[PDB]
Every structure is written in C-alpha cells, then in structure tokens.
Curated annotation (Swiss-Prot):
Proteolytic cleavage by ADAM17 generates a secreted form. Also cleaved by serine proteases: TMPRSS2, TMPRSS11D and HPN/TMPRSS1. Phosphorylated. Residues 10-21 are annotated as: Interaction with SARS-CoV spike glycoprotein. Changing residue 5 to V: Increases slightly the interaction with RBD domain of SARS-CoV-2 spike protein. Essential counter-regulatory carboxypeptidase of the renin-angiotensin hormone system that is a critical regulator of blood volume, systemic vascular resistance, and thus cardiovascular homeostasis. Converts angiotensin I to angiotensin 1-9, a nine-amino acid peptide with anti-hypertrophic effects in cardiomyocytes, and angiotensin II to angiotensin 1-7, which then acts as a beneficial vasodilator and anti-proliferation agent, counterbalancing the actions of the vasoconstrictor angiotensin II. Glycans are attached at residue 33. This is Angiotensin-converting enzyme 2. Changing residue 9 to F: Increases slightly the interaction with RBD domain of SARS-CoV-2 spike protein. It comes from the Eukaryota. An engeneered stable, dimeric and secreted receptor with combined mutations that increase the affinity for human coronavirus SARS-CoV-2 spike protein shows potent SARS-CoV and SARS-CoV-2 neutralization in vitro. The extracellular region of the ACE2 enzyme is composed of two domains. The first is a zinc metallopeptidase domain (residues 19-611). The second domain is located at the C-terminus (residues 612-740) and is 48% identical to human collectrin. The cytoplasmic tail contains several linear motifs such as LIR, PDZ-binding, PTB and endocytic sorting signal motifs that would allow interaction with proteins that mediate endocytic trafficking and autophagy. Belongs to the peptidase M2 family. It comes from Homo sapiens. The chain holds residues 21 to 59 of 805 of the full protein. It is found in: Cell membrane; Cytoplasm; Cell projection, Cilium; Apical cell membrane.
Length: 39
C-alpha cells in the first residue's frame, strides 16, 4: 500500500513525463512572441 503509494506516485510519471513536459515545452512557446494561444 505504501509501496503502491510510492510506485503510483512514480508510475503516474510514465503517464506524465510527456504530459508534463510536452505541456511544459508547450508552456515555453507562449513566451517567444506575443502569442496567447500558447498560454
């Protein structure tokens, strides 16, 4: 349960190294220009 808390707070990362960073690399491109579509 505690490991299943540890690993699900580590395997959600397998759903979200992309779904953070490919939203966070996408958080970046708001800032090179006056473009809001990025925000």
């Amino acid at each position: 349960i505690e490991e299943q808390a540890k690993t699900f707070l580590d395997k959600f990362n397998h759903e979200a190294e992309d779904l953070f960073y490919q939203s966070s690399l996408a958080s970046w491109n708001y800032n090179t220009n006056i473009t809001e579509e990025n925000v």
